[PDB]
Structure formats: C-alpha cells, structure tokens
Symmetry: C2
Subunit: 303 residues, 2 copies
C-alpha cells in the first residue's frame, strides 16, 4: 500500500542512476498485482458508447474507484499473468523471426496490465507523486525495450530534450516529461518515445519537440513514436467512459506542425481508428509498437 | 459578488454575438473596483526576491487571499482610476502623434488594474468558470484595441485557429483558448494576440500556432504578439511570490520552433529582462503593446 511507493522509488532510483533496474521494476508489478488481488473489489463500472460499445471495469476499495479498466485487456488472474509475462519475455528475443497477432495481442495485454496495475493501485491508495504511474510507464517500457533490442544505445541524453523536460517539471511538479531516446548503434538516427498514460492537452508536446529536433539536427535524424495507454475519461457520477479525442488537432499537427512516425495505444479510442487520421498517421497498438520499433532498428533507420 | 458574474456574462455574450460590448465591459470594471473597495481588506502580502526585490500586495476577505498584486501598479483609488481611464481612452485616439513613457506607464497601469480587479474578485468570491478572468482579459483588450485602431478588420474567424480553440475547450473546460485576430484593411497581413494572465505550460501554444500558420498561409501573413499580466506564483504558506520562468524553453522555441514578434507583460518577470531573451525576442510592456500593435498597422504590416 505504502510499500508500493517505496518499491517504485527503488526501481526509479536505479533507473536514473542508470543501473540495471529491471529486477526492481518487476518487483513493483508483482506487488501491485497482489495488492489489487488481496484488497480490491473488481466489477463492471461503465461503458463507452459510439459506433460500438466498449465496456469498462473498475477496481474498488472503501468506496473509492480506480480509473476505468478494459476487462478484456487486463489480466485479472495472477498465475495467468506470471506465465504470460515469461512467454512475452521470450518472444521479444525472437521478434525478428516470429511476431504473430497472438504475439502482439499478448504484448499489448501484458503492457496494459503491468502499467494499469500500478496506476489503479494509486487511484485507490492515493500515495505518491500523482505522476508516479507515468513514471512507472516509462521505467517499464525502458525495461522491455532493453530486453528486445539490447544492442542499441540507450544511455544518451540530448541537451534540448533535457532542457524541455527540466523546464516542464519547474512549472508543474505533477506533470513531468517522460521521453525515451534510443540511438542506433550503426547509423546516425534515433527514436524518441514520449510516454503518457493519456495525452489531454499535452498532445502538442511531442509534435513541437519533433519540429524542434528537425530544425536543429536536420530532417532524418529523429523519429518520434508516441506510446499511450488510452484516452479514456471517467465520469464518476454517471457511470460511463468518455474518449477524449481531438482528431482535427492531430491532423493540423501532422500536416502543418510536424510528422510523427506513429501513435500507439493499448486501448485505442474508436475515433482514432478512422481514415481521416490513419491516412496521415499510423495509429497502431502497444504490441505493434514493439515490432515497429524493432523493425526501425533492423532497418537501421528510415522507418 | 454574484452580480459580477452576471455582469461579465452580459459583456461576454455581447462579444460572442459580435455586438458593441464595450459599455457592458466597462460596467464590469466599475463593479469589480467598487466590490474590492467596499468589502476587501488590502495589505502587503509577500515579496519576490532576485537581482532586486519586488513587493506584492493582496486583497483579503474572510480569511481568503487574492493572487499577489503589484501595489505600485494597481490603482487602489476609484476616482483616480476613473479620471485615469478617461485620459487613457483619449490618448489612444492620438497615439500616432503622442505616446510618451507617461502614456505607456498609465496604459499599463490601467490595463493591469482593470484585469486584476476582476481577477482578484474571483479569488475572493470564487464564483464563475474559473477561466472567467482570462475571458475578461480578452474582452477588455478587444475593447481597447477597438478604440485605438478602429479601421482594421476584427470580425474574421480563421478555420485552423477555431479548430485549435474548440479542441482545447473539449479537453479542459477550465483552460480555454483566447486569441484575438486583427486583419489589416490595406494588406494581406494580420496579427494574432494570444491572451493569458500567466502562461504556465501553455507557453508552447502560441509558438506552435505561429509555426502552423506560417506553414499553411505562408511566412509573412501572420505575426504573433503575446499579451500577459505576469508570471507570478503565490506561495500562500511562506508569504512570498515566485516568478515562473522558462528562459531556456522560450529560446529553443524562438529559434527552432517559431518566431513571435513580441512578449508583453504588465508585470514583467525580472528574469525575462535579460539579453539571453531580449536579444532574440522583444519583451516589452502592455503599454508598449498598444503602440507596437498600432505601429504594425500604421506600417500596414512587416513589424
């Protein structure tokens, strides 16, 4: 409960110190999962309604509700999740040769569960920076991306990215920038992975950053892939789920501000699945994310 | 108290309907001023400390405090303010011929007082959209800019600006975009005035917008001038005032994201007065703002 924060802080500190943080981060997953399992109620909460219906569940504790959870996506069985996680782990070693839709669906479900397990724990036991789930999301992904392409350069900091993130934190201590830079060992090209659970008004931020990097380093050096969990919004009173989408804005951004290589969600909002977006920017999955990122580095750039 | 909101709503509705809103907006100033005068305590609150000291005052009511107010800037005498306002009004008619430092200082002090009088009323009597002071700031400035250059085209809406503002509001109903577009009657050029009391993380927003307009309409069609009140932040516990500045970020933004014509404050943060910013972007005053904007249109563009 308060053991969870301590446990994150351990993994968070290892990460900043730039040490092997993966064991300590798995320990956070283990503990968040067992916490919800032994203390939290779990039921149907509300639905999103558009072209289709999407049902969402919530974890409960002493009245309080967690953010909405796609039950069809969250693995609510611990032993299931444990053996799932190991196979997910081994499939990343041979993603070059095999990456079926079953490999993608489970990578997606695993990432979702891992991040959302930590997130929901904070919604119920409200202890931490309130930006800690965002922090765990970065740490976790940094963990997985390391298992997968362990030969690419992780430990580079770029001055202008550090500038934007330092200044961001100096404004709002609760809204802090988590971006991952992976540079290719073999060519002068690298990816930049802005991580956010949900985007809200910070949707311009990856676009603006891409623009800045293009006009500072030149056009084919940095490629941005955006990783998210959802765009869900809880309406706690009416027991239903919104999807906060700005399709017009993203199109303006893609066309006239800057181009990103892709947008990725565990829980893709139904609105973002349409051609008005997908024509001009890939909107894929967190399982698709891993392959796309790997593919980029196999290609040595240019994707 | 609750009469103030009703009174703003009247002026706000006239404005959106695109009618003469100036009388109804002066009535809001009249009433906010008399409210603070008859009900509010007024004392020294705290200071900012850097290269120099800057003392700030606050209005009080039933324990509650208003945001910090530069006493040297706010006109706390009603009759003073009233005769001040009229002369300010007449000087805008002949700003071409005369605009001394005394004309600029009083324009600055008048704008400051008008906007901050409404703002502090909301901090004490907490009734309204919580974005209403921002709303009044736009309305007020739109009022003054109309007295000054009454021959330029105010009533144009640009699709892509409407898109960004509509989407902004759809995300956060409390954080809404207030930008003024004035198009020159005589040449294909116009200004875009993003208004914000303080900027916070929304500092990228005018830069990104400028970029988008340059890459959609071409480079010499839109020029952005940023109008603010301060960058003050209250620390209610320690009784002192911070200045939330991001000088590195604005430089990155000016150089690599987009160029704005100027940045204007009633209460310019001391940090923004340095050459590292002022070399690459004008950082002037709200009194200087009026002349600069007028100058732009006298020039018929290009400034």
């Amino acid at each position: 409960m308060d053991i969870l924060k301590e446990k994150i802080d351990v993994a968070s500190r290892l990460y900043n110190l730039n040490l092997d943080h993966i064991p300590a981060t798995l320990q956070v997953i283990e503990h968040a999962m067992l916490l919800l399992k032994n203390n939290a109620g779990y039921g149907y909460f509300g639905s999103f309604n558009g072209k289709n219906t999407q049902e969402y569940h919530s974890f409960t504790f002493n009245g309080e509700y967690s953010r909405p959870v796609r039950d069809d996506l969250f693995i609510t069985d611990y032993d299931f999740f444990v053996s799932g996680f190991r196979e997910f782990n081994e499939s990343l070693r041979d993603i070059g040769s095999k990456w079926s839709s079953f490999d993608s669906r489970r990578a997606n479900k695993i990432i979702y569960t891992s991040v959302m397990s930590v997130a929901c724990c904070f919604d119920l036991w409200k202890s931490g920076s309130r930006k800690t789930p965002g922090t765990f999301f970065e740490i976790f992904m940094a963990a997985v991306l390391k298992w997968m392409i362990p030969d690419e350069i992780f430990s580079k900091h770029i001055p202008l990215i550090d500038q934007l993130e330092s200044d961001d934190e100096s404004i709002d201590p609760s809204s802090v920038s988590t971006d991952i830079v992976i540079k290719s060992a073999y060519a002068n090209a690298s990816v930049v992975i802005p991580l956010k659970i949900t985007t809200r008004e910070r949707i311009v931020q990856p676009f603006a950053q891409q623009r800045i990097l293009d006009s500072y380093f030149g056009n084919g050096v940095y490629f941005s892939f955006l990783a998210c969990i959802s765009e869900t919004q809880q309406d706690k009173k009416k027991k239903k789920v919104n999807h906060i989408c700005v399709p017009g804005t993203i199109r303006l951004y893609q066309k006239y501000l800057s181009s990103l290589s892709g947008m990725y969600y565990c829980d893709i909002p139904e609105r973002y699945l349409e051609r008005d977006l997908t024509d001009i920017i890939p909107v894929r999955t967190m399982g698709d994310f891993l392959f796309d990122i790997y593919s980029f580095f196999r290609s040595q750039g240019a994707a």
